[PDB]
């Protein structure tokens, strides 16, 4: 590993990207369903 997981910056920019990416991936969900 790197981060170790236990970070709390980085992540929040990955995650801080799925608020977004929700749209692209939430919203595509019910085409998965």
């Known amino acids: 590993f790197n981060r170790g997981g ?5 992540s ?3 995650v801080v990207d799925a608020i ?3 749209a692209g991936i939430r919203g595509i969900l019910k085409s998965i369903r």
């Open 6 to 10: 236990y970070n709390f910056g980085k």
């Open 20 to 22: 977004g990416s929700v």
């Open 12 to 14: 929040v920019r990955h």
